[PDB]
Enzyme design. Structure first.
Site, short mmCIF file in Angstrom:
data_model
loop_
_atom_site.label_atom_id
_atom_site.label_comp_id
_atom_site.label_asym_id
_atom_site.label_seq_id
_atom_site.Cartn_x
_atom_site.Cartn_y
_atom_site.Cartn_z
N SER A 196 0.84 -1.21 0.00
CA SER A 196 0.00 0.00 0.00
C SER A 196 0.87 1.26 0.00
O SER A 196 2.10 1.19 0.16
CB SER A 196 -0.93 0.03 1.22
OG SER A 196 -0.40 0.94 2.21
N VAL A 232 -1.88 0.92 -4.57
CA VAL A 232 -1.99 -0.32 -3.83
C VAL A 232 -1.67 -1.41 -4.86
O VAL A 232 -2.11 -1.33 -6.01
CB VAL A 232 -3.48 -0.54 -3.43
CG1 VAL A 232 -3.68 -1.90 -2.75
CG2 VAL A 232 -4.00 0.58 -2.56
N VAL A 233 -0.88 -2.41 -4.47
CA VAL A 233 -0.71 -3.61 -5.29
C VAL A 233 -1.47 -4.72 -4.55
O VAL A 233 -1.32 -4.90 -3.36
CB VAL A 233 0.78 -3.97 -5.52
CG1 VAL A 233 0.94 -5.28 -6.29
CG2 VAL A 233 1.49 -2.85 -6.26
N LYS A 250 -1.97 -3.34 -9.92
CA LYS A 250 -1.54 -2.08 -9.35
C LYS A 250 -2.68 -1.09 -9.58
O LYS A 250 -3.06 -0.77 -10.73
CB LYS A 250 -0.26 -1.58 -9.97
CG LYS A 250 0.37 -0.34 -9.28
CD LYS A 250 1.87 -0.51 -9.26
CE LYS A 250 2.59 0.76 -8.87
NZ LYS A 250 4.07 0.53 -9.00
N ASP A 259 13.14 4.24 -13.74
CA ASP A 259 13.05 3.93 -12.32
C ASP A 259 13.75 2.63 -11.95
O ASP A 259 13.19 1.79 -11.23
CB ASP A 259 11.58 3.91 -11.90
CG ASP A 259 11.41 4.18 -10.42
OD1 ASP A 259 12.35 4.79 -9.85
OD2 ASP A 259 10.36 3.80 -9.85
N1 LIG Z 1 3.91 -7.94 -10.46
C1 LIG Z 1 4.13 -8.00 -9.14
N2 LIG Z 1 4.09 -9.20 -8.50
C2 LIG Z 1 4.29 -9.31 -7.18
N3 LIG Z 1 4.55 -8.26 -6.38
C3 LIG Z 1 4.61 -6.99 -6.88
C4 LIG Z 1 4.40 -6.78 -8.33
N4 LIG Z 1 4.54 -5.44 -8.52
C5 LIG Z 1 4.80 -4.85 -7.34
N5 LIG Z 1 4.85 -5.77 -6.36
C6 LIG Z 1 5.10 -5.53 -4.92
O1 LIG Z 1 4.03 -4.76 -4.36
C7 LIG Z 1 4.56 -3.78 -3.44
C8 LIG Z 1 4.16 -2.34 -3.80
O2 LIG Z 1 4.47 -2.10 -5.18
P1 LIG Z 1 4.87 -0.64 -5.78
O3 LIG Z 1 4.04 0.40 -5.07
O4 LIG Z 1 4.92 -0.72 -7.28
O5 LIG Z 1 6.44 -0.62 -5.40
P2 LIG Z 1 7.10 0.42 -4.38
O6 LIG Z 1 8.58 0.28 -4.67
O7 LIG Z 1 6.59 0.12 -2.99
N6 LIG Z 1 6.55 2.04 -4.78
P3 LIG Z 1 7.21 3.04 -6.08
O8 LIG Z 1 8.54 2.40 -6.45
O9 LIG Z 1 7.39 4.37 -5.37
O10 LIG Z 1 6.17 3.05 -7.20
C9 LIG Z 1 6.07 -3.92 -3.48
O11 LIG Z 1 6.42 -4.62 -2.30
C10 LIG Z 1 6.39 -4.76 -4.69
O12 LIG Z 1 7.49 -5.63 -4.45
MG LIG Z 2 7.35 -2.13 -7.95
#
Ligand SMILES: Nc1ncnc2c1ncn2[C@@H]1O[C@H](COP(=O)(O)OP(=O)(O)NP(=O)(O)O)[C@@H](O)[C@H]1O
Ligand SMILES: [Mg+2]
Ligand SMILES: Nc1ncnc2c1ncn2[C@@H]1O[C@H](COP(=O)(O)OP(=O)(O)NP(=O)(O)O)[C@@H](O)[C@H]1O
Ligand SMILES: Nc1ncnc2c1ncn2[C@@H]1O[C@H](COP(=O)(O)OP(=O)(O)NP(=O)(O)O)[C@@H](O)[C@H]1O
Ligand SMILES: Nc1ncnc2c1ncn2[C@@H]1O[C@H](COP(=O)(O)OP(=O)(O)NP(=O)(O)O)[C@@H](O)[C@H]1O
Ligand SMILES: [Mg+2]
Ligand SMILES: [Mg+2]
Ligand SMILES: [Mg+2]
EC number: 2.7.11.1
Lengths: 278, 281, 279, 284
Positions: free
Chosen positions: D19, D24-25, D40, D140
């Site tokens: 989150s 949120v994922v 996402k 990124d």
């Molecule tokens: N396709 C995916 N499969 C499994 N886990 C995922 C996937 N995409 C993202 N995650 C996980 O979900 C969580 C939140 O994702 P996200 O918000 O994209 O990354 P973040 O590094 O926390 N934020 P940001 O880099 O600022 O966009 C993270 O712990 C990721 O590792």
């Molecule tokens: Mg990510």
């Protein structure tokens, strides 16, 4: 920001009075279109022996002078028998309040503000004055009470224009006496440089030199004595130990009876004393 | 005591005596008075002025009468002009004498001698003392304004309107503690002491022919006088040995009048008692 | 006249064209109520691909900045699809005119302007830039063409606000971001003017900016790829720089630092030894 | 053979994986595809963006498929969110691993060893080459965006919409008259930037796998800016006090990093060239 300031009275909600003379009131106000709390100076034209035709050049000058060391003038408009001047609200009080406070706590033995706070505050005053002078303007009412402090630590000169103007009274010659010559030529920005040297004395000792005398005796005391120094009005000469030779020389350059001998604000900014500005 | 006429037609205009931008002095015959007068005709428009602004001057003129002050008779407006009707003194002025001496080239050991300066200026001091006792100021004391009667009389001209216009014409609540001195000087007025300074300059002019800063443009004269110590008898003079004959009492007299600080100058009554004025005939 | 400038088109009578371009037209105008001949810059908002909404802050800034070394701005208003900027009319041409005259005549064999002439003109520019910088402003288009001379001997920077703006193109914790990406994230500040000022001094000395010989897209890369330029960059022969000593060259190298943090402020430059040459 | 559904009724939302403010994922079951996915959910209002600004990002995402880039399946708006439907990588990220090693206290003398850094970053470099030679930039690159398959796969996350938003949107998009008077920092802005920006980020990511953190992680966001623009490019040791925390990182790793960390983009190698580096021979 974007737009111009509103000349509609109804765009301003009057709030707490900040100061109140005879007869001008500085009152806080909220301006909704700008989402800003501002200070309004409310000047009854009748009571000040003035008019809008007399004040126009003064308002034109305020509309044109914009610098970080000059209190921002926003706009002005007439509300019935009052001229309203809308300016930035400075929340830090004046240098004079800080003086009154130091004195009331009895912290003024050995001097009121130390040499480096004076260098700092008056450096900012000289930058504002230099800007006004370059623009062909004169402040006319430089004193501690017109040096306002922002919450951001900024130092701003107040009352440029209408206020200063009203405070200071409003508006071949081979045989002609010097004192007639003086009034024939009028005066110039160098007058501010004298008031600036008085203001330095006031920040160091807490008062202008002849402060113990009635208004009409100050006129005579000034003209019939040598220029004043730190020693003129000070309670005790012990208060003058915080202050050295370069400060005294800075002051004495300002306080010469001949305006031509006074330095400009830019030359003063270069003085040895202003190296103490921290 | 019998009134002067205020009808333009009662005055027949004659020789033009002096003509400028702003003002003509003209002889005139006044038939009802059977008298030849001088009229100073002043262009009010050219002088940037009005009868409103001049009223108090005219009033002072009609009240101030003394043997050492040119007699003012009456005044009235003709079209665009203020006419000032006064005594005719055809013998002219001390300046006319100065210019004659200079013109002949007879000015190299001085213009007027000490006894003749003392005689003339004594009479000017009597006129000035009268004005000053009475709360009046002349404002324009100089050789060109000292007129001479056929009878030997010495009379100061241009009191009132003319000295007013010639010299430009042109508080506040709170304590002026921060105000510059040049600002305070403008705020306070000036007073009769200003005539004493002009008197001292006039003494210089009678001896040397000219005012000390006569060789400078109008704005440089202001700067030099305001910026420097007062002028001496010898400032406007290249032959610094010219006035070697003019002595200590004359020089002392001039230096009392020529003080930057008006409070320090003597009154006209006080000057009359100066050792120098014992030299008068 | 103590009154504000009129914002009615009809109070202005448009006369001779002073200057032009594909973009804006500067015309002499007489303003009847103010009995003054003024200059109106007429910018075609359509052709500049801009809007009054993109420009209001610029005009705000113009309306606030007043200094004897900045061309006076009187007023502005929209007429049809044009923004009209009413300004002081200056009759002495630019420093660039003077440069082009000296160059066309071949008088630039040991340098275009004398050192004391450059010091005098640029001191005045630095007073105007310092003022603008103090007020949180940036000029963006400092160059010889934008330094105007009054026939009274005044030196005034032109085109602050809308014109300079148009002439010039209108996260989280960023630990992984490349510096060229961070540079655009951060934008830029008034130290950009100090670089332009340094190129402007070269222009006054040599007659042109250092990479003037190259096309405009290669100027970007030429500048970015090389050490900062000097007097010597855009010139033929070093005897053409015979007028210019050590302190001038040092003043310029101080402005022409690739890192903006290392450039001095305009206030600091005014204290430079070079500027003691100002008549 | 069945296309990925754009009907929200085809998806059952399950456990929240991550989150935040922006997004949120969330795991989800896609019914017609019979597969557990990650979605996402991006709040377009909160992110101060719109579907119009994002369309070229989405287009690039639907075009860019490679085994070393997390599979983008589809996207659609539900109310005020954009849903990006993508493959679920339950193994999580390289940063999860770093965090686990640091929480165990096992990060003294270093985080991941050389050969495991080599294995992972080679896979990232493959994905980067694919992107770059196709005219794409990731923007990124970092450990948190390197996702791991149950099967051993290494894939770059957040290509397109997410990386765009995370780096400030059109602020970092990559007049007539000659720009002769223009300051170099203004010129750098007018020129934009290219795929070489990703090679710097890759260099920082290498330090991160080795030390646990980017060089200036201790500093506020604007101090980091100032530092990286004012100072010399960082090295393996820049934010590390006991420098013996890097004993088992050799010279070819540090040289690899220093090739990446040059202020001048043109001096930086391509991902292709980096793949040929002697350091990536330590990959298993
Ligand atoms: N396709 C995916 N499969 C499994 N886990 C995922 C996937 N995409 C993202 N995650 C996980 O979900 C969580 C939140 O994702 P996200 O918000 O994209 O990354 P973040 O590094 O926390 N934020 P940001 O880099 O600022 O966009 C993270 O712990 C990721 O590792
Ligand atoms: Mg990510
Ligand atoms: N722009 C401003 N922001 C904040 N406070 C202000 C501002 N202007 C004035 N003040 C204060 O409000 C009061 C103003 O009253 P004013 O009528 O200016 O007379 P004064 O300041 O008492 N005397 P003087 O300054 O010599 O005219 C004083 O207390 C000032 O310190
Ligand atoms: N009442 C008078 N009788 C005879 N001649 C006079 C009289 N008043 C002035 N004059 C002469 O008229 C001429 C013009 O005089 P006037 O208008 O006083 O100008 P001015 O003396 O040249 N300068 P000023 O006195 O400063 O205005 C002078 O030559 C005087 O000597
Ligand atoms: N206030 C002014 N007074 C007199 N002349 C001016 C004024 N402003 C501009 N000019 C001149 O009018 C002409 C055309 O104006 P402009 O469209 O600004 O062209 P420019 O000088 O090339 N400016 P730029 O926008 O920097 O290219 C130029 O030759 C200017 O020097
Ligand atoms: Mg105040
Ligand atoms: Mg006369
Ligand atoms: Mg121009």
């Amino acid at each position: 920001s974007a737009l111009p300031w509103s000349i509609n009275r109804d765009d301003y909600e009057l709030q707490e009075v900040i100061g109140s003379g005879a007869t001008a009131v500085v009152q806080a106000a909220y301006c909704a279109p700008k989402k800003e709390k501002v200070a309004i100076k409310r000047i009854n034209l009748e009571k000040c022996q003035t008019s809008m035709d007399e004040l126009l050049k003064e308002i034109q000058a305020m509309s044109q002078c914009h610098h970080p060391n000059i209190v921002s003038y926003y706009t002005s408009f007439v509300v019935k028998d009052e001229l309203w001047l809308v300016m930035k609200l400075l929340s830090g009080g004046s240098v004079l309040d800080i003086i009154k406070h130091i004195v009331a706590k009895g912290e003024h033995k050995s001097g009121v503000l130390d040499e480096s706070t004076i260098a700092t505050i008056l450096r900012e005053v000289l930058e504002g004055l230099e800007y006004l002078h370059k623009n062909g303007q004169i402040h006319r009412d430089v004193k501690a009470g017109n040096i306002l402090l922002g919450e951001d630590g900024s130092v701003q000169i107040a009352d440029f224009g209408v206020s200063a103007f009203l405070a200071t009274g409003g508006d071949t010659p081979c045989w002609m006496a010097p004192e007639v010559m003086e009034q024939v030529r009028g005066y110039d920005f160098k007058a501010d440089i004298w008031s600036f040297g008085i203001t330095a004395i006031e920040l160091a000792t807490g008062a202008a030199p002849y402060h113990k005398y009635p208004p009409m005796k100050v006129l005579m005391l000034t003209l019939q004595n040598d220029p004043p120094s730190l020693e003129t009005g000070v309670q005790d000469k012990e208060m003058l130990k915080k202050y050295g030779k370069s400060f005294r020389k800075m002051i004495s350059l300002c306080l010469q009876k001949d305006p031509e001998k006074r330095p400009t604000a830019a030359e003063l900014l270069r003085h040895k004393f202003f190296q103490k500005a921290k």
